[PDB]
């Protein structure tokens, strides 16, 4: 509120709102936003000569193809809401079926987080909850990307996950800390961050950064657009120039490292 703006090196973005008690109106309020993924396009659009505006999402979190219809950013792109689409987006079999993807720039996948006793997806503990000890719980945020992938290979675990579904991210970690859950499953690109900027390094990932179903993050564009060749080539060029390492360090810090 000093000047009704925010400091330089940050891009404004028009966030929608659902109005006050849905009585009337609902104000498109200008509030600038920053982060990692937004920073990369700011430097990117200095060599392809873009002009851009941002507006955040309306409904859902990422998307799901249910009843032969889509909603989410993937839903937005398939109906031409925006030519480009950035942010936390996961490349997968179903997603690439309808919309094209670029070359990924950061590697990731899925992982498990526990407090302070098993080997992984084949561990016999995960196989059946019929052991002597009382059953433990999973985090497994619904309506996500992993859940659709998890359903694909073996079902009996997911119907167990249906009984207990976590909400949000921060709400899940405190529940694990208190002892409401015991095995949180989510993508690794963010769990390593949360374990890093934490208190006491009490939370870790299993093994030496063990990863399952390695996957990359990238930018999705509309099918058949001529932007494909240029956006691919430019994104690859910054990787060679040693820029990803520098941008990673600032927004990927290690306290427990």
């Amino acid at each position, epitope marked *: 509120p000093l000047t009704e703006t925010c400091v330089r090196n940050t891009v404004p973005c028009r966030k929608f709102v659902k*109005i006050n008690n849905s009585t009337n*109106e609902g104000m498109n309020v200008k509030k600038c936003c920053k982060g990692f993924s937004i920073d990369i396009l700011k430097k990117l659009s200095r060599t392809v000569k873009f002009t851009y505006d941002l507006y955040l999402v309306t409904n859902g979190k990422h998307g799901k193809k249910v009843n032969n219809v889509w909603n989410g950013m993937i839903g937005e792109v398939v109906y031409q809401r925006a030519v480009m689409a950035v942010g936390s987006l996961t490349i997968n079999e179903e997603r690439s079926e309808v919309v094209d993807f670029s070359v990924p720039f950061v590697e990731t996948g899925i992982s498990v987080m526990v407090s302070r006793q098993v080997t992984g997806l084949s561990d016999k503990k995960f196989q059946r909850p019929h052991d002597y000890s009382p059953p433990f719980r999973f985090g497994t945020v619904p309506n996500g990307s992993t859940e659709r992938n998890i359903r694909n290979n073996y079902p009996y675990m997911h119907q167990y996950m249906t009984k207990f579904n976590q909400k949000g991210v921060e709400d899940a970690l405190v529940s694990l800390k208190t002892g409401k859950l015991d095995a949180f499953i989510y993508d690794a690109a963010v769990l390593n961050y949360k374990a890093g900027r934490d208190e006491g390094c009490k939370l870790v990932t299993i093994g030496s950064g063990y990863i399952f179903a390695t996957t990359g993050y990238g930018i999705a564009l*509309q099918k058949g657009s001529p932007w494909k060749r240029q956006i691919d080539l430019a994104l690859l060029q910054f990787v060679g120039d040693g820029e990803m390492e520098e941008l990673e360090t600032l927004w990927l810090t290690g306290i427990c490292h």
Partner: nanobody
Amino acid sequence: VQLQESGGGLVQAGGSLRLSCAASAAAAAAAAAGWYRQAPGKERAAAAAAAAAAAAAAADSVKGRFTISRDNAKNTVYLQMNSLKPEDTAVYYCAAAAAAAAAAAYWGQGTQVTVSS
């Protein structure tokens, strides 16, 4: 802003119609125009779209039956529909979004299209 839809009626299966939605505005170059369908017992569904750049997307469900067009000179978007089937019986709606504004979902009174023997 306010729009207005028209063009409905009763037409035998395999026939054609020309629905139309129009609105008043001095900036009419830049609005997404979309067609929505909502039959009794089913949720609202997208049918056809037109982008600001000038690209056309058609839903795969009833792909090829109808076609979309927009006139930059005159503020009206009319939907040319052909080879009617009973599966298309519904009330079609027109909408716009973005280029300013707020509370962004805009719906006309509605035009009912009836396909039957």
